[PDB]
Structures are given as structure tokens and as C-alpha cells.
Amino acid sequence: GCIGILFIDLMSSCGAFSKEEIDEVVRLGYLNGLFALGRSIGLIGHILDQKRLGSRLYRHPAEDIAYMMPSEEEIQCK
Amino acid sequence: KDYVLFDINTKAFVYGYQTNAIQRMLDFDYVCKRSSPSISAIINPSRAGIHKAFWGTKEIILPMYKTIPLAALAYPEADVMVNFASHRSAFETTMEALKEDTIRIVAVIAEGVPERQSRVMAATARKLDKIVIGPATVGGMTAGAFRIGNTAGTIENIIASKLYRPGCVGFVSKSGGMLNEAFNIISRNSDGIYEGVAIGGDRYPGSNMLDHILRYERNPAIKMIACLGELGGEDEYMIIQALKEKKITKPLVAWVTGTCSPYLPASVQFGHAGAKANTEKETAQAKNDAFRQAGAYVPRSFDDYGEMVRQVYDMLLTRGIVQKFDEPEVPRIPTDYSKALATGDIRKPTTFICTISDDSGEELLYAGKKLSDVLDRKMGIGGVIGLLWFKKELPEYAAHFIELVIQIVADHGPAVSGAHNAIVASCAGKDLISSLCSGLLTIGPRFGGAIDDAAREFKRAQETGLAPEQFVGEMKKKGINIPGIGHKIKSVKNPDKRVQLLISYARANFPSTELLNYALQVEELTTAKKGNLILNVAGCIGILFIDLMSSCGAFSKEEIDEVVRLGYLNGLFALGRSIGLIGHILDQKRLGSRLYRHPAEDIAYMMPSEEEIQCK
Amino acid sequence: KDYVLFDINTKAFVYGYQTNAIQRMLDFDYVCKRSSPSISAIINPSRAGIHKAFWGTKEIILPMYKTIPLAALAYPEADVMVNFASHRSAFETTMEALKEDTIRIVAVIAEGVPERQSRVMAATARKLDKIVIGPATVGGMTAGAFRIGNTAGTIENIIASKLYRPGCVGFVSKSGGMLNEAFNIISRNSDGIYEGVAIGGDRYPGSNMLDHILRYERNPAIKMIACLGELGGEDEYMIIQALKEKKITKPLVAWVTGTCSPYLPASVQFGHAGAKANTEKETAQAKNDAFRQAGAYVPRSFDDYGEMVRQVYDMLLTRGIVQKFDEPEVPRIPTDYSKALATGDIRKPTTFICTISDDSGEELLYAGKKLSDVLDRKMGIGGVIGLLWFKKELPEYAAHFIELVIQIVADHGPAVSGAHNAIVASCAGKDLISSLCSGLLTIGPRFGGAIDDAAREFKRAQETGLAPEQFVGEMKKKGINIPGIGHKIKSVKNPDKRVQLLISYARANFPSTELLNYALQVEELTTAKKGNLILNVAGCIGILFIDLMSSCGAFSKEEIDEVVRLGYLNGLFALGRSIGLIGHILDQKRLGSRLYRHPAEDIAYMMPSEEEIQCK
Ligand SMILES: CC(C)(COP(=O)(O)OP(=O)(O)OC[C@H]1O[C@@H](n2cnc3c(N)ncnc32)[C@H](O)[C@@H]1OP(=O)(O)O)[C@@H](O)C(=O)NCCC(=O)NCCSC(=O)C[C@@](O)(CC(=O)O)C(=O)O
């Protein structure tokens, strides 16, 4: 929220964008690109960290999942 | 029976998403050996859905409804509503529940409810033969049968005070916290409470103490009545008048708090909204004296309340009015993991290790360094990558070489595989993230992702002592392309200025460029055969990064070997080229581009014959 | 001191990745108040790296080395090796450790080690002034200082037997399990053991009982010696001879098990490899008699062993030889979560719910139905999708319509967005999964992913009572394309036979096609304007699926509304079209296709001017 709001203030006040240009930027969705680009640094870092650690295959623990199957009656009708 | 408020068959709705209160009720139902939970549904005005909670150690699902009428229609057996609405909505929600034919009791927890609203709720309850416990109360409970929300706290307290089995004492107070203290006092000085109710401390309650005391008088299971009142209002005078009119025949223990008031200024308003003696009659002294004169068992102070309970109970026990019963088996319940972990009782191993960042403290850390210090020191994007990928605070020229690479590989036009796929996904109306990943997934051995292999193969050739001609010759014999060599459009005739820009930076700032010098000798040989076999941008980055790591002093030979083996360097191209991919995606959205379909005239459709698909 | 085997400064290597034994050692070090762990490194022949374990409630890292020389060179302070190698490698690993100048003690756990190998290990140990405890032993321990692997079991047993503080008893046995029982017996009948060692039950041990008994005789902290032997071999005769030669002056409690042997056949070989009396001298009777005659304190049977310990200790206590000491504070350690969970002490809520499959039992379940029953009933791929996506056992014609859709949308040539992107990634040398996802990420509103919106918009128009002309008119006014209408190559002039095939199946098998009839009326109007505005394959699937759900009897109005709102139907196109995407990827790999780069002549490069980039 802080990045999106401040970027609108930046575009509105820097003199480089017209009201139409700002409206186009908002409508088309540019700003999520900043988070994808920035966060790719940490994602690549986490990937490399697990390779250096020699980490094993993960399987989510069964004790963290409530398996709640429907009854035979439930799958036969509505 | 009209005198029974709750029993072991009582079903209730909990208005408000109060997960702790919901769990407390279920835990009591479980230790009381109930067959099914005392809660039929949760009323959550913000969301309809499901709520998962425990039944001992087993998880169960409770339905969640948005409104009171929808829940009542689904569960008509539920006649109690535990109302956790704020003081801003307590009146309208209680009045809505009271208008439902199937709801009989409403417990109002909220503090700060107007006196007029409480007067209207009390009158509405009396007119419809319903019960309002509160406002400003925890509720109450029938020992061994039902509890209102948080009444009687922890299961440990329920067990210590033997609240999982009924006794012979009918208890009523104004105070919620004192109702729990009283449960402890009474359990230690008698066979415990049968039922206990806190009417709240507001001067106009939904139900007065006498309403509950009259029910205890009719109940044959109750042989003893006990109550704890306070100064302000005239509620206790209803009890004293009933005691004088012989409407209460069972022995009644009574104490009115607020004896401090005459010693302090007249203007002092106490905790509860109704705890302020406006007249002499409203004082604790006038109330305790009128109680004494009416025949009640009144102690000298609150200190001897349990002793008065012990005296009245012992009297009933000797006279045969109350019978001694065998203590039932002590119930058990598993402790919540979070409690056992907090008290240090248990330990649990972590599944993952993280060495590059920590978000769990007061400030985000990148390889142990506070984000504030990273920014104050102007480490920049290259310095952030040094910390997160290499766990090093790199020399400035090494962080600037990383930033130079990102700018140099940011984009190389729309025609390359990654930009082309991202443009096709953007023309198909895809969002930015899907379109970006569509293009990033083309990064591999032929496009972009040759950096790791160029670093690997040139380092091996130069280290194992191969002459550039022997390396070129060996790779040709194995039928393996030299990674970092060759280009689709750049060549001897069309030189790649990006490679020149990376080479000038390394010559001006790296203490040594031995692997670059070797790579340039390999390039002289490859370009002599075919002009397009230049040292490309991927080969240039991989080779220069090896020279950077070898000469900056920050990496040992082992660290460099680990970087090469694990494949770090293709990350630089993925990161840099994401700038141009996002740009191409946005360009197609601004252009209003239509869906692309590859032209048929660019595809040779060559189907196999029927004979070919029938055999081999 | 030569008599001390282990102390509080002893550092050790654990040969073999025995995580439980590693944790047991660390837990003992923690309860004994050691400053640092007793383990310097783990020797894991399969892998070098790190091992995470607990130090109380805190997690620590232990280094892991592939070989004994590499670990010894890294941690020269470690002089003990706890060897968990199998009987197949116990000799060579113990001999390798004995050849290391810095290793002094090796504990061999393995059972089944040849007698010749043990003879060579014992002689090698004696020649180099080193100690071999084992083979076929748990090890031993110095109370309050160090434990060999699993010696003395659980921390609960360590606390109950007061093994966190030394006593005055020097103990030695053959049996590992009896060494732990003896720790309990001795703690209850004296101030406990100072040190205890189990030499193993093999007839040629690495160290004999006398080796340890002689160390106890020199140690001033030990005032009492106790030992438990057994029939077979002549080990105990070394003790009796030392007792006769006045080499053991401290009082010695001794018992030799195997008194049963003369009552049973001579051929009976007992548990331990060395437990078989070949001669009369080797029997328990001959050993216990020779012990009695040598001056040792020998009980009547094993039953009175603790009583003999109590008698000898009490004698030392009265005579002043042993001094009474104050019991140190009882140490504490957190319980492992898994133990508290198994015993039912704690409960922990699940984060996720799964309602569609269960892999945690004896057999995989798809919506509660065993995979075996799914296959025996020939439910097919359509029936599997009915279970996993809809949680229904669908009628056969509904499961066959799902399979018909998958076949019909499997491929539509290489030119479409998804197939085109998957081909470009495959030409770039990408693996199958990356290339597949590159193409699947183009599935959205214009290509493939129009199914959900077609179902949504046509259902709304038909339900809200809009006439086909009003729906066409309303969408045009909003500037919104009708989803499921329009095509790049199919039209009135080039009809889509896939749409015809789906329509014929629904007419022949669905009880009703009301939404299809409405959609076909919309198509008459759109095609009247432009021939390419046909009801496309995505619109046809979405609309027919609504008719299928509405008419098959298996879905309520609410269930259908939920399916439409959440977007299930685009999954059918993703699943079906993955067949053709994988096919196109494989086709390019078989063709040996080169890297694609979009031709420059198909791109209009239109850069902004310098003036345009400087202002707005
Ligand atoms: C680049 C390309 C795929 C071109 O392929 P082509 O399809 O044109 O050629 P091929 O069909 O493989 O063969 C042609 C003839 O030359 C021989 N020949 C070719 N390469 C040879 C070689 N490496 N070693 C020896 N010999 C070779 C081959 O043996 C045959 O000769 P012959 O047998 O006598 O008939 C190819 O060189 C290659 O795989 N290189 C290694 C991978 C690599 O480093 N990739 C990074 C490139 S930078 C980048 O990705 C970023 C980019 O700059 C991209 C952009 O802008 O485009 C941007 O910023 O976006």
C-alpha cells in the first residue's frame, strides 16, 4: 500500500507525467512489477541457500492437515 | 422445569467470532462427558463458512452463519445465545435474538451499554418470559452441564474447583471475576456450586439477583443459596423483601461489598457502572444490616465468607438436609501445544534453516545486517545482492559490477525467446506475473542461461592446463557447443558493444582478468572459423564473474568452486532481463495489441502416413 | 591421569549417522551442566555437511565429515570415537581410528564381529596404550561427565538413577542391558556409580573386565568395586588372580550369571557369543566359588546383588572410608514434542483441511473412495475428475462427457498461443516441464480460459430473463466481448466440427440443453454481423457443462452457483490442452529444432523521440 500510494504522489508531483499518463499507469497495472522484480532477489537467494545447505525434499507434515473425506452418501447425490 | 436455566441438553449460538471462548465452551463440554458440543453454530456478521476447533484431541467443524435468523432457522434446538457483540451493537443483536421464538436466554458480555437500552432489554425479556444475563458479565454456569463463554476460565481452574460435577449451592453475584473466585471459595467450604450466575455491575441489569435466587428456591437439587452484592442501586432490597415475605426458605449466605465508601469521598464512582451509593440506603452498611435483620447468614467481612458457607453447609449435612456424595472420576484434557511450548515443557525441531535473512525481529536483517544500516551505508542493489546471494559485504566495485550487468542485460529487444513469449502471453490478455513467468521459463542453455556453464567450462579448461586450441578441439570432438560462444545476430561484422562495456569495466577495476584473457584467445580461434562464434554477453558475464571472485579477496578457492558448481550466475540474467520482459508486457498493454496466432504460412504441416502410424 | 577414561573435558566423534544416539549424548551433556557438547564432529561415510540437533531447547549445528582422518585433523582435541559401524566394517573403522595419534578410546557397538578381528583390535589397543570398549556393547559412562552413545537410555532414567553426579562405585559388566539395570540397583543401595563400563559379551573382547577394575583401584574417588560377569571364557579368573595377588584392595562385589547351565543341556549356546561354558572352569559355579575363596563379596543369587552393594557401602560409610555428600540440584530438560503428542499430553491444531484425497492410510482415497474400487468399477479418467474436482461419483455419461472434452481440446495445432510458447521454450533447449508451463501460462481470457466466463455470462443472461438480442446489445454497450464467442480461424465459412461433436453428444445424452438452445440463438445474431463471431469451443464447453450440471440430478442449484463462481471449467482446457503442448515440445526435440528468434522484419521498431522522453 505504501509503494502504490507513494508512486502516485511521485508521478503526480515530478512534472514528468500528465493526468492521462498517470491514469494509464494505474489502469494497466505497472506497480506490481516493482515487487516481482525486487522480491526476485530474495527468491533467488532462498533457492541458493537451500542448495548450499544440501536440503532434502520437503513433504508437508500429515499432523498439519485435517483429512476430512466426504461420506459415501455425500458423493452419491448432492 | 421453569427453574432450570441450562442443562446437559442445552444448545447455544455464539454471536461473534470468539475462538478462545468457543474452545473454552467445547473443552468444558468434553470434561463434563457431554455427547455432543453445547454450540450449534457461530454467528459471524462478517462471514459465513466453517470454524475448526477441538473436541478433546479430535478436530471438529462448527458451521458459521452471517445472521441470527439464518442460524436459528438452521438450528431451532439452540435456545441460548452467548452475545459477544460490542456495546455499539449489543442492544440490537440481543433484541433480534429475543424476537426469535426459539431463543430463550441471551447472555450480554459487552461493557458500556446505555442504561436505557438495558432497561428495554430487561422489560422485553420479562414480557416474553425470557432471560437476559448481563450486560457487563462473563455469564455463569451450571456445574457439569453448560458454561457461558469464558465463565470459570481454564480447564485447570474447572478441575481445581470441581466444576465438572454439581454441588448443592445456588450462587449469584454482580461481579464476573468474583463469580470465579466464589466458585473456588464455595468448592473448598461445601460440596460446590450447583449453578452460579453473575448479573453484571450495571445499575439496570437484564436480570436482577432475585430472579436467579427464586429459581434456586424452586430447584430441589439446591439446598443452600449464596450471594455477593455491592453498594449502589436497590437490587439487594428485592432479596431482603423476599426473605422477609418467606419467599426464600433455604438458608441464604449474603455479603454486600463497598464498606470502604463512607471512609472515602462521596464523589467516588467505583469500577462497575452501578457501583455508586447515591443514597444512604444504597450503601453496603445499610444493605448488610437489612440482610442481617431479614435472617440471612451475613459474615463480619468478605474474609469470613467461605467460613459462613462452611457453617451453613455443615449445618445441612448434620441435619440430613444435604447428603454426602462420592466424588466422580477426575476428568482429563490435553494441553495446548502453545502452552507446553511457552512454559518450556516441550521442544520441537525446525524443518528448515535460513541463513540469508531474518524477518522475525524488530528489524529486517539481510545476512545479519539491519536494513537501516544497508541503506545508511548506500550499499545499493549490488550490495543487497552481495548480502542475499553471497552472504558478503562486497567491495564497492564488485557491487557496482553486479549493477552494471543488470543494466547491460535489462533488454535485448522483443525478438529473443523470453521477450517473445512474454509478449505473446501479454497479447493473450494475461496479467503481468503470468506473462513474466512465461518468458522467464525460456531461460536455459541456448537463451540467457549459458552463464553458469560458460563459467564452468572456461574455468575447467584454463585450470586443467588446456591450451585455447585444445579446448576448442576437445569440445568439437565431444559434439558439445562451447557455452558463452555464438550469437543469433551479433558477430565479427556486427560486434556486441555490451561485451566491450563489460570488458572495459573489468580492465579498469579488477585486480586481474586471467580467465578473460584466456576466453579472448578461444574467441580468436572460434571467430576464425565462423564470424558468429563470438564471446557472447552470457560467456562474458560468467568469465568476468570468475575473475571478480578470484581477485577481489572476498572468496576462498572453495567458495568460488561452490558458486560455480551450484549455479548462481544465471540468476543475474533472470533478474536483469525481468526489467525488459515487464517492459515488453506493458508495451503490448499500452498498444492495445490483439491476440497473436502464429501464421500458417510459417509452418510446414507434415503429417505421417496411415502406414507410418500403424507400425514402426 | 592414566586411570581416567572419560572426564567433563572429553571430546568425541560419532562414527555413523545415529541421530538418536547423538541427541542422547547432547542431552546428558546438557543435564550434567557441561559448557560445550561432548561431540566435536560426526563421521558420515555417505555425506559431508551439517547436522542440526538440540542443546536443551536451543538448536546447534554439528559438522559432518566423510572420513576419520579428515575429522581428526579438524578436531585434534577429540580422543574418543563412538563407532556405530556395522559388523562388516567395525574392524577396519576401529583400526583406522586406532592408527590416528589423537584418538585414544574406541567404543565398538556392532554385534557379530569375528573373534579374530576382536583379538587383533585388543592387541593393537594394548600395543598403542589405547582402549577398545566392545565389540557388542552399549559402551559405558562416567557419571556427571560423559556417556557413550545410548548408554543409560532416557534422560528420565538418568535422573531416576542419579547419573548426572558421580558416586563411589566402580562398575563393570559384560552385558549392556544389565549395565543399565545395575546403574539403577547401585543408585538405590549406595551413593551410585562413579563410572560404569560394559565390555560386551563376545569371548574375545577389546578390553577385559580387569583392565577397567585396575583403573578403579587407582582412582581415589572410587572406594567400592562392583562387577557382573557370566559363564563361558576365563575373563573373571583374571580378577580372582588379581584379588589373590592383593592387586585389588578395595572391597569388590561380584556375581557371575549362568547358574542355570548344569540344569540344562551342555549344547545350549546362550545370547552372548561368549556365553557357553566349554569346560567346568568356564561355568558360573566354578567362577562364583573361586570369587568367594578370593575374598570378594558374592551374593547368594542375582536377587541379593543390591543388598550386597548396600552391605559394602554401609560398611564404608560407618568406617569413614566413604563420606556422605549433599545431593546436587535435580537437572531439567524439555520433553520432545513427539513424545508429549504420542502420550496424549498435548494437542496441536492443523493449519490445512483436505477434503478431496487421503494418502495417509493403508490405501490412497479419492474423495473417500479407495483407488482399488475406483479402478475395479472402471470409473475412468472422467470418474477420477468427478471425485477429485466435484467430490461426486458422477453418472457414466457425465464422466464420458469430461473425457470427450479432454480428447476434443487435446490439440489445435502449433500456432495457438500456448502451443507456440511451449514450442519456443522447447527450441530454446528447455526441459519438458518448463516448456509446458511457459505455454500453460498463456491460458486466459482470449486463449482457452474463456470457459468460466462463458458459463457465467450466458447463465446470467438466460436466468435474469434477457432475450438473446438484449444480451448481445447490453454487452456491446458495456464494451465487453461476449466470452465464448469469436474465433481467429473458425467461422460461418470454416465451421468448427469440435463444437458440432460436443453438441451431438449433449443432444443424445443430456436430459436437457436449455442454455445451449439460448447460446445458439445468441450465435445466430452475432454471426449475422460478422462470420467469425461463432460460438467457439470454449463457449460450447462452458454452456454444455451448465446444462450437464443442471440436468444430471447430482448438483443442487447452490452447488452449480459455487462451481460457476469459483471457476472450475478452465481446468478442463488446461488439462486437455497439456496433451498437445507436451506433444509439440517432444516434436521439436525429435526434429532437432534450433533456437527461435522472432524475425526483425515482423516488428515495427518505433522509438520515442528525445523530446518525448524528456517531458510528458
Ligand atoms: C547462440 C546459439 C544458440 C546460436 O545458435 P544457432 O541456432 O544460430 O546455431 P547452431 O544451429 O547451434 O549451429 C551453427 C553452427 O555453428 C556451430 N556453433 C554454434 N554455436 C557454437 C558454439 N557455442 N560452440 C561451437 N560451435 C558452435 C555449430 O556447431 C554449427 O556449425 P557446423 O557444425 O559446422 O554446421 C549457439 O551459438 C549456442 O548454443 N551457443 C551456446 C549457448 C550460449 O552461449 N547462449 C547464450 C547466447 S547470449 C543470450 O542468450 C543473450 C542474448 O544476447 C540473446 C539474443 O539477443 O539473441 C540477449 O541478451 O537476449
Ligand SMILES: CC(C)(COP(=O)(O)OP(=O)(O)OC[C@H]1O[C@@H](n2cnc3c(N)ncnc32)[C@H](O)[C@@H]1OP(=O)(O)O)[C@@H](O)C(=O)NCCC(=O)NCCSC(=O)C[C@@](O)(CC(=O)O)C(=O)O
Ligand atoms: C477469439 C478472439 C480473441 C479473436 O479476436 P480478434 O483479435 O480476431 O478480434 P478483436 O480484435 O477482439 O475484434 C474483432 C471485431 O469483432 C468483434 N468481436 C470479436 N470478438 C467478439 C466477442 N467475443 N464478442 C463480441 N464482439 C466480438 C470486436 O468488437 C471487433 O469488432 P468491431 O468493434 O466492429 O471493429 C475474440 O473473438 C475474443 O476475445 N472472444 C472472446 C474470448 C473467447 O471466447 N476466447 C476463446 C476462443 S476458443 C480458444 O481459445 C481455443 C482454440 O480454439 C483457439 C484457436 O484455435 O485459435 C484452441 O483450441 O486452441
